[PDB]
Amino acid sequence: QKGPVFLKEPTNRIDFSNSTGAEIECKASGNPMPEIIWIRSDGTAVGDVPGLRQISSDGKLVFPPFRAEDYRQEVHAQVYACLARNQFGSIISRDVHVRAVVAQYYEADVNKEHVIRGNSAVIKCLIPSFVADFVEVVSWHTDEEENYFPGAEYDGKYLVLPSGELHIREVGPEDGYKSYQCRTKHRLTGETRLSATKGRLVITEPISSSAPRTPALVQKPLELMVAHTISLLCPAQGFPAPSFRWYKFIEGTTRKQAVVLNDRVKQVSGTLIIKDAVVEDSGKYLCVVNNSVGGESVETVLTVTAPLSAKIDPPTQTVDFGRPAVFTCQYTGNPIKTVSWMKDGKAIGHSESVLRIESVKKEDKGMYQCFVRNDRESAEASAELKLG
Amino acid sequence: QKGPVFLKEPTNRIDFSNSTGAEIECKASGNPMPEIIWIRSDGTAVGDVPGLRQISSDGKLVFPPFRAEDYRQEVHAQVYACLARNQFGSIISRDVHVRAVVAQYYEADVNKEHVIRGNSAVIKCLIPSFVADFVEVVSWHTDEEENYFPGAEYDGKYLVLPSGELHIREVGPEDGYKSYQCRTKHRLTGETRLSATKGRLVITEPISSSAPRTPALVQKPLELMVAHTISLLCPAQGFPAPSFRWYKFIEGTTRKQAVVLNDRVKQVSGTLIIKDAVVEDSGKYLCVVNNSVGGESVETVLTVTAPLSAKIDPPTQTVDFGRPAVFTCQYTGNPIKTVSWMKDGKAIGHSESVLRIESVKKEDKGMYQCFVRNDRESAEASAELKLG
Ligand SMILES: *[C@@H]1O[C@H](CO)[C@@H](O[C@@H]2O[C@H](CO)[C@@H](O)[C@H](O)[C@H]2NC(C)=O)[C@H](O)[C@H]1NC(C)=O
Ligand SMILES: *[C@@H]1O[C@H](CO)[C@@H](O[C@@H]2O[C@H](CO)[C@@H](O)[C@H](O)[C@H]2NC(C)=O)[C@H](O)[C@H]1NC(C)=O
Ligand SMILES: *[C@@H]1O[C@H](CO)[C@@H](O[C@@H]2O[C@H](CO)[C@@H](O)[C@H](O)[C@H]2NC(C)=O)[C@H](O)[C@H]1NC(C)=O
Ligand SMILES: *[C@@H]1O[C@H](CO)[C@@H](O[C@@H]2O[C@H](CO)[C@@H](O)[C@H](O)[C@H]2NC(C)=O)[C@H](O)[C@H]1NC(C)=O
């Protein structure tokens, strides 16, 4: 009576500590009831590995909590999928990226920041790149017992930015007798800790003028989710302390327009803050920094991401032999890198949103799917062809 | 009998400490002998400022050595030019960027480097951005008394890169009991010093696998001079320790080709080293980093610069009223941002290498120049038009 359709798929990312374990669920309908098979996204079937990966009834793949000694990459750092299948054909779920992380000591550091008196400073909490997916800055603390949290600026001077740095306006000689530590939190173990080192501003008295200089290492392209606040920094030091202006390129041109500052889009010194991000905020930004000696600029690319979703019209159709069958994949989200089609679990080499079979024949019957992907997510829709 | 031509112009950059002072020289020929006037590149005449800027005979602008208290931006952080002029017309020199820097304490730092055991490490000497134009890494030293200099790899393990970092292969638990300091040199004062802090590798035992991760801050576009060795880094950490491959984009496409490693172009772990750089090495490079869990990539832009030079054909010509006069500017160097023309010291709004006057008339007689610029340098050529 019907081919398979998914009712529940697991999300794209399943991250968890060895102590927590995980379970992922897949449910499909169909008649006859489809069998559910777990596969690695490349298509090989996966089995039971004692104490590590267990197929449950209902429809669940279980990763029990496990001791560090028992970590296995092929189980615990793997991209899975669910295959649902009956006599009418097969469909595969979106990719399920499993990342079991053994609970392990890390430290964050705060180093010295060399600044010219009168410039803004940005104090950073350095989190090792290999743990940074799981660790976020909660708050900043000084030796004089001042505590700074994300939200609003303190004393017209200190602001914990959305990206985690502590921004300090108009640094003075005085500010070099303070030391700064960050509190971080690990989302898989839930633990919080203070930074292993404390940083201080080291203030240079301006005795010579200099044109603004920006660091050698700059923010690589950013991907941030819709509806969250974003901060784009522009670190620069010079004397006279410089002024900062932000521009956004017109897509596919070398032309730019001044960013328009309002209730939603604000600038704090050289920092651009955009609340309530929307996909149209994506693009290429330029910060231009000037003083009476000279100027400099740096580009930052921003993509504002939105969850991927897909749906095929029509979800089922019957077409008489020799006649055309059209399936249209309707999708949402940002960015969309690719669209691609499968039939009964096998890529069919069509990468456009509308799939046309010009003249239907027996072996065209079965289940079709459209997958929409980008670098971080995937979404699928399915559809059945019945012969008339 | 003749309009002015420059015999000697000052170079584009004159950098010097307050203790050293500076003198810059401009000589031109012509008949009558041209007068030499020093100007700020925007065109205003400059005068004597007691003890700071003095016009010498011969043809020299002198910046005497001066005490810190006596620094003056309008004298000491300024773009000058020489104007040479007689009854036939005027020519202006290339820009002369003067940067007098008061001798002042700085420190470099070496911070902790968190690495996964078995990966490569790069230990960096952090030089504040506002002094980095004048400070270069000489050498690296450990507490165990090992001294590393630029040139060849030590013990198949340690290499001081052309860009100054200390590269360490295949880090082991053992390597965390060593501490590293850099020796730097300031080119204006000649002094050398060791870093104010020492860094250590902090080694994480790999207990979970992870895909390669690269830092948030990456090398911004590089400009390096012909005939020097360049190193492009690709910092990445993961487990299994990753492999690295470099590609270079085909200009104006999204297509890329594998970099070809040979006698001149080498790879040390993930570091690409190109000796004897040529202008054709310019472009956009991609480093791709892989292990059995996943992959990542980062782009770095390189421009290999070559000194700018310009010459006009013909250097003088006479043309009868109503007939055409053509001047062709021939130039060399890299990059060329602009070409632009002047007549008797005034921009004339032509930005192509060949200048045509379609039908010559009286007030067309005089001196013409072509200037070729990029962001760091300028070069000029001049030519006279005589009426026939
Ligand atoms: C998950 O892995 C870690 C081993 O890192 C386990 O946590 C350790 O447990 C031992 C003994 O109970 C403690 O003494 C260590 O202090 C722990 N280290 C850390 C970093 O927390 C944990 O028991 C494991 N989970 C299991 C096996 O269910
Ligand atoms: C502020 O600084 C920026 C320098 O980065 C200056 O903009 C440049 O201006 C020059 C001269 O007009 C142009 O050729 C460059 O293309 C500009 N760069 C950019 C990124 O726009 C700008 O002129 C400065 N403002 C003042 C008043 O000096
Ligand atoms: C250039 O400027 C610096 C002031 O920074 C002068 O150097 C100082 O000179 C005094 C006394 O001779 C020393 O005690 C300080 O130790 C010096 N400081 C530094 C950083 O070197 C120098 O004399 C000046 N040059 C002149 C006036 O010709
Ligand atoms: C090594 O890692 C890079 C990942 O950055 C992989 O290249 C990507 O491959 C995917 C799948 O083919 C492409 O869609 C991306 O466009 C690729 N990115 C780049 C920058 O080339 C590559 O596949 C990896 N190699 C292996 C064997 O897994």
Question: Which of chain A's residues have a Cβ under 8 Å away from the Cβ of B68?
Answer: 207
Ligand nearest to the CA of B102: 3
State the method. Answer: X-ray
Spatial contact of B124 and B233, defined as CB atoms under 8 Å apart: no
* Inter-chain Cβ pairs, chain A and chain B, closer than 8 A: 121
Reduce the DSSP state of residue B321 to 3 states and report it: coil
Question: Which CATH homologous superfamily contains domain A103-206?
Answer: Immunoglobulins (2.60.40.10)
The C-alpha atoms of residue B11 and residue B180 are separated, in whole angstroms, by 38
Q: Which of A129, A214, A215 sits opposite B214 (nearest CB)?
A: A129
In the chain, the amino acid numbered A44 is: T
Question: Which of chain B's residues have a Cβ under 8 Å away from the Cβ of A129?
Answer: 213-216, 236-237
In the chain, the amino acid numbered B89 is: G
Could you identify the residue written with the tokens 């292969």? Answer: B169
Could you identify the residue written with the tokens 């009964």? Answer: A344
Contact residues for A41 (Cβ-Cβ < 8 A; gap 6+): A79, A80, A81, A95, A96
Q: Quick one: DSSP state of residue B154?
A: B
- Residue A251 phi, psi dihedral angles, 5° rounding: -50, 125
Contact residues for B90 (Cβ-Cβ < 8 A; gap 6+): B4, B83, B84, B344, B345, B367
- Whether residue B214 has its Cβ less than 6 Å from ligand 4: no
Q: Cis peptide leading into A240, omega within 30 of 0? A: yes
Asked if the Cβ–Cβ distance from B112 to A109 is below 8 Å, we say yes
Task: Give me the helices (H) in B61-196, please.
Answer: 73-76
Burial of B262 (0-12, 13-18, 19+ CB in 10 A): exposed
Asked if the Cβ–Cβ distance from A73 to B130 is below 8 Å, we say no
The C-alpha atoms of residue B122 and residue A355 are separated, in whole angstroms, by 50
Q: Quick one: DSSP state of residue A3?
A: E
The structure was resolved to a resolution in Å of 2.0
Tokens of A99: 């990342």
Quote the ligand 1 centre to A14 CA distance (angstroms): 20
B103-206 and B308-388: identical CATH topology:
yes
The C-alpha atoms of residue A86 and residue A36 are separated, in whole angstroms, by 9
Atom of ligand 1 nearest to the CA of A70: 27
Question: Which of chain A's residues have a Cβ under 8 Å away from the Cβ of B213?
Answer: 129-130, 132-133
Reduce the DSSP state of residue B18 to 3 states and report it: coil
Spatial contact of A362 and A385, defined as CB atoms under 8 Å apart: no
Tokens of B36: 């030499």
Spatial contact of A298 and A367, defined as CB atoms under 8 Å apart: no
Provide the CATH number for the domain formed by A207-307 in this structure. 2.60.40.10
Spatial contact of B206 and B239, defined as CB atoms under 8 Å apart: yes
Quote the ligand 1 centre to A11 CA distance (angstroms): 27
Q: Quick one: DSSP state of residue A280?
A: G
Spatial contact of B261 and B271, defined as CB atoms under 8 Å apart: no
Q: Quick one: DSSP state of residue A46?
A: -
Q: Quick one: DSSP state of residue B36?
A: E
CA dihedral B221, B337, A285, B128 (to 10 degrees): 40
Asked if the Cβ–Cβ distance from A237 to B128 is below 8 Å, we say yes
Q: Quick one: DSSP state of residue B234?
A: -
The top-level CATH class assigned to A308-388 is mainly beta
Chosen from A130, A131, A301 to mutate, greatest number of chain B CBs within 10 A: A130
Domain ranges of chain A: 1-102, 103-206, 207-307, 308-388
Contact residues for A195 (Cβ-Cβ < 8 A; gap 6+): A107, A108, A109, A110, A125, A181, A182, A183, A184
Q: Which CATH number fits domain A1-102: 3.90.110.10, 2.60.40.10, 3.90.930.12, 3.30.870.10?
A: 2.60.40.10
- Whether residue B104 has its Cβ less than 6 Å from ligand 3: yes
Reduce the DSSP state of residue B176 to 3 states and report it: helix
**Closest to B339 (Cα-Cα) out of B315, B305, B310:** B310
For chain A, the maximum distance between any two Cα atoms, rounded to a whole number of angstroms, is 87
Spatial contact of B331 and B309, defined as CB atoms under 8 Å apart: yes
Task: Give me the helices (H) in chain A, please.
Answer: 73-76
**Closest to A113 (Cα-Cα) out of A168, A58, A51, A188:** A168
The C-alpha atoms of residue B86 and residue B28 are separated, in whole angstroms, by 11
Q: Cis peptide leading into A50, omega within 30 of 0? A: no
Atom of ligand 3 nearest to the CA of B18: 1
Q: Cis peptide leading into B32, omega within 30 of 0? A: yes
Atom of ligand 2 nearest to the CA of B338: 14
Atom 16 of ligand 4, nearest CA residue: A375
> b vs e for B24-57, b when ≥16 Cβ sit within 10 Å of the residue's Cβ?
bbbbbebeeebebbbbebeeeebeeeeebbeeee
Could you identify the residue written with the tokens 């990226």? Answer: A97
Tokens of B182: 């850099």
Reduce the DSSP state of residue B211 to 3 states and report it: strand
The C-alpha atoms of residue A97 and residue A15 are separated, in whole angstroms, by 8
Instruction: Give A68-126 as a 3 state SS string.
Output: HHHCCHHHHEEEEEEEEEECCEEEECCCEEEEEECCCCCCCECCCEEEECCCCEEECCE
Parallel, antiparallel, or unpaired: how do β-strands B96-101 and B13-17 relate? parallel
CA dihedral A221, A224, A229, A231 (to 10 degrees): -10
**Closest to B82 (Cα-Cα) out of B19, B21, B14:** B14
In the chain, the amino acid numbered A233 is: L
Give Cα A205 distance to the centre of its chain. 41
**Closest to B307 (Cα-Cα) out of B12, B79, B6:** B12
Contact residues for A120 (Cβ-Cβ < 8 A; gap 6+): A167, A168, A169, A170, A171, A241, A269, A270
